[PDB]
Design a protein around this ligand. Structure first.
Ligand SMILES: [Mn+2]
Ligand SMILES: [Mn+2]
Length: 537
DNA sequence: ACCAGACACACATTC
DNA sequence: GTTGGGATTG
DNA sequence: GAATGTGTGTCTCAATCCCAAC
């Protein structure tokens, strides 16, 4: 309805920062917000376009908007302020990004030009010839169009990182929200600001991101570790990311064959499952000695239910290749292992979708829900428990879930609420509770509540067949490890309404063999005498 | 939940 | 001349 | 064939487009 939707939403961000994050701003950055308001309606619009767009540099032909008048006119106030820069200095690398493949051939006609292979390969070709950067006028002085470079991107991304609690979300969040595509729970403005404590937390987040940026963009390890720290962080979720960065770094040291580094690195990170990869890295360096000594420290005090699974695998192999005795390990009994061989030639329909078709009977129906039913059914019961605001949970409106979810204190900071809601599960009114929370909070962008899947018909069936104790067992387990137990469950779930009873079943072809996350789920089920099975084809 | 978990799929190797 | 991935769009 | 690793492919609103693709 409003052509300047992107401008109004951009104003809404700077307005939010002026209100709440006033003291967290700097002298020259306050001047930016003030000066921005003093730009024409057209020049405010033209600026924000170049931000939302991916690139930093912009060919004038690509900045053709109708909301804004003449692009060459509305840009002038930005060129005056220096926020935009005409006649910018750019490299051969980012010159390719602006020009088409055809135009590049004309310019480099008699300067080593062959029948091109690939654009990224052409860049690799003109690296040593034109290493130094120049202005556009210095590459093709004859070139007609002007190119605008955005000088205030660093400033912009700071305001974005402050509005949100991260950088992964972009300005599209406003559009997708206003259009009703993403509907969020209007959590109350309780913790007015846990965006950040001081600027120190921002620069930390920002410089870590720069290393990540300089990693995908190929740069050697010795360069990226020079700026990194050996000392951990104080801010909880910030320390978690630095750690998570070291993890993704160690992966590359193992993807390529340099296990000495990967191994030494995995131990410096307190990331989930990093301890394991340190052992598997030693294993793959003929370091069985220190692989076992470390594996012992894990055996004496594991990291999670998943870690325990890894040790059972690794220990016999290390103990074996060492002089030690091969300590025995455990295995799972294939519960209700049903099999069926149906042969057909053509139709490429989904495998899991086809099994749903076969189990269909006049007495029982089956739904294709891999970790979907129990997740949503949990996220509704403990809905109000999750979206309750702690002093450092929520801050901006467009948030999917409470920020302290991956933190181990997620259950502790809500230990009261979760126990109040879960009380209903063994007590009465677990059906009346879910229903009210189903109708009231429908369609919202909640974690582990897949609305688009859970239909009104399915829900009522599950509530009857799925018993109190089994729901009482499942949900409690998710709370032990939320990031860990969110995945790995039976593809299908069947219900027998008459003599109320259900049964979950994972379906596999011979080409598959189930995963570690699913295996851990089948164990938990057989232990509690939960009707479950595996189906082969 | 920061180009990711989250399913199958495809290779290798070993008691 | 093809076709399809990805920045762009609201 | 069992059970092991590890390495790929797929995909997040949907309709538009243009530029570089084997
Ligand atoms: Mn599945
Ligand atoms: Mn399956």
């Amino acid at each position: 309805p409003e052509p300047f939707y992107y401008l109004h939403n951009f104003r809404a961000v700077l307005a939010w920062i002026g209100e709440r994050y006033a003291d967290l701003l700097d002298d020259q950055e306050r001047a930016f917000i003030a000066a921005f308001a003093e730009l024409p309606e057209a020049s405010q619009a033209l600026l924000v376009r170049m931000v939302m767009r991916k690139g930093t540099l912009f060919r004038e032909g690509k900045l053709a908007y109708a909301e804004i008048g003449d692009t060459r006119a509305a840009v002038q106030p930005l060129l005056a302020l220096g926020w935009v820069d005409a006649q910018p200095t750019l490299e051969l690398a980012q010159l390719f990004g602006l020009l088409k493949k055809d135009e590049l051939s004309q310019l480099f006609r008699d300067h080593l030009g062959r029948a091109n292979l690939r654009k990224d390969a052409l860049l690799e070709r003109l690296q040593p010839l034109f290493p130094e950067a120049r202005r556009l006028a210095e590459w093709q002085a004859d070139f007609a169009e002007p190119v605008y470079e955005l000088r205030c991107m660093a400033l912009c991304d700071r305001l974005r990182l402050m509005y949100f609690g991260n950088l992964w979300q972009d300005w599209s969040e406003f559009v997708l929200a206003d259009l009703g595509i993403y509907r969020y729970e209007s959590v109350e403005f309780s913790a007015d600001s846990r965006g950040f404590r001081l600027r120190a937390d921002v620069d930390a987040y920002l410089h870590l991101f720069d290393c990540r940026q300089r990693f995908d963009l190929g740069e050697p390890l010795e360069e990226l570790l020079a700026g990194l720290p050996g000392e951990p962080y104080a801010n909880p979720w910030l320390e978690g990311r630095r750690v998570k960065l070291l993890f993704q770094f160690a992966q590359h040291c193992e993807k390529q064959r340099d296990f000495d580094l990967a191994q030494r690195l995995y131990r410096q990170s307190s990331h989930p499952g990093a301890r394991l990869r340190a052992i598997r890295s030693l294993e793959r360096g003929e370091r069985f000695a220190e692989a076992h000594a470390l594996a012992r420290e894990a055996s004496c005090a594991p990291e999670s239910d998943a870690e325990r699974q890894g040790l059972a695998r690794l220990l016999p192999r290390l103990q074996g290749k060492l002089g030690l005795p091969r300590q025995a390990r455990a295995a799972a009994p294939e519960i209700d292992r049903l099999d069926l061989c149906l042969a057909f030639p053509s139709e490429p329909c989904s495998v899991e979708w086809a099994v749903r078709e076969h189990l269909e009977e006049p007495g029982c129906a089956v739904h294709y829900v891999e970790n979907g039913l129990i997740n949503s059914l949990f996220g509704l019961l403990c809905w109000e428990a999750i979206f309750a605001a702690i002093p450092g949970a929520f801050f901006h409106p467009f948030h999917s879930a409470p920020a302290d979810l991956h933190s181990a204190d997620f259950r502790q900071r809500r230990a009261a609420l979760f126990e109040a809601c879960l009380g209903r599960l063994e007590d009465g009114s677990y059906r009346d509770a879910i229903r009210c929370r189903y109708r009231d909070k429908f369609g919202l962008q909640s974690p582990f509540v897949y609305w688009e899947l859970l239909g009104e018909e399915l829900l009522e069936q599950a509530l009857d067949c799925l018993p109190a104790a089994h729901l009482r067992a499942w949900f409690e387990r998710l709370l032990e490890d939320i990031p860990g137990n969110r995945a790995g469950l039976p593809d299908l779930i069947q219900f027998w309404p008459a003599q109320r009873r259900y049964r979950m079943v994972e379906v596999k072809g011979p080409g598959d063999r189930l995963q570690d996350n699913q295996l851990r789920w089948l164990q938990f089920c057989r232990e509690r005498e939960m009707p479950v099975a595996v189906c082969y084809v």
